[PDB]
Amino acid sequence: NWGYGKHNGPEHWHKDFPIAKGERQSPVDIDTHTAKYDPSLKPLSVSYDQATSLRILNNGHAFNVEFDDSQDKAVLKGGPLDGTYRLIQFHFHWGSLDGQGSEHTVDKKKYAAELHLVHWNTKYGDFGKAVQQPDGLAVLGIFLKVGSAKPGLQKVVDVLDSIKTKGKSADFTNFDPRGLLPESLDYWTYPGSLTTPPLLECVTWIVLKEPISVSSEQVLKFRKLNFNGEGEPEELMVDNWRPAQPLKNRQIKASFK
Ligand SMILES: [Zn+2]
Secondary structure (H helix, E strand, O other): OOOOOOOOOOOOHHHOOHHHHOOOOOOOEEOOOOOEEOOOOOOEEEEOOOOOEEEEEEOOOOEEEEEOOOOOOOEEEEOOOOOOEEEEEEEEEEOOOOOOOOOOEEOOEOOOEEEEEEEEEHHHOOHHHHOOOOOOEEEEEEEEEEOOOOHHHHHHHHHHHHHOOOOOEEEOOOOOHHHHOOOOOOEEEEEEOOOOOOOOOOEEEEEEOOOEEEOHHHHHHHOOOEOOOOOOOOOEOOOOOOOOOOOOOOOOEEOOO
């Protein structure tokens, strides 16, 4: 029943999901002056050369690009992570206007959108078990700003017309998520949660410092999606972001000096 509107959005989620007010919630504001360089962080390893995308789905809240995670193909390791985390999906959050849309903020700066590459810890066998663990998931977050087009995003943009409404999916094989990454892997990391219901506190967040640029035209096509299902009154899929939550007793670590 949850969504992003006035009557079902982030300020309501706590009634069905009391962990919304928990000690480990995401997103957060990243205060760059308070975050500390951590020389114990190891190099981050993003190994997507054997990634196998399968399908793209409009789930009524965003669209997910889904991957075959039955094998160690696309994996995240290193940085703050112990062991191997397998990519299962990515999706975005974005605004109705270029001045908002990201979930994490940087010194209170909101970006136009934010990409989440979702990975689960292979020591727990599958995603469903991983989300019962405090180190079950690792999400790589990448900010998007409006400027030059991102060529690696276009295949995504061009298929959204086929998945306009909730429940629609399309085949989406041979998509390469390397083309969504910025040049630098400098990042901030902290322990947090899923940013949508059920808001489970299972995530090691890795937020890249360098945004990618996308064109105004690319984001405008995101904003033509629908939260509603086919044949229902149109409610544009915009502002599907949760605002920053209290940092509470957490530390944000930087990978860079
Ligand atoms: Zn997300």
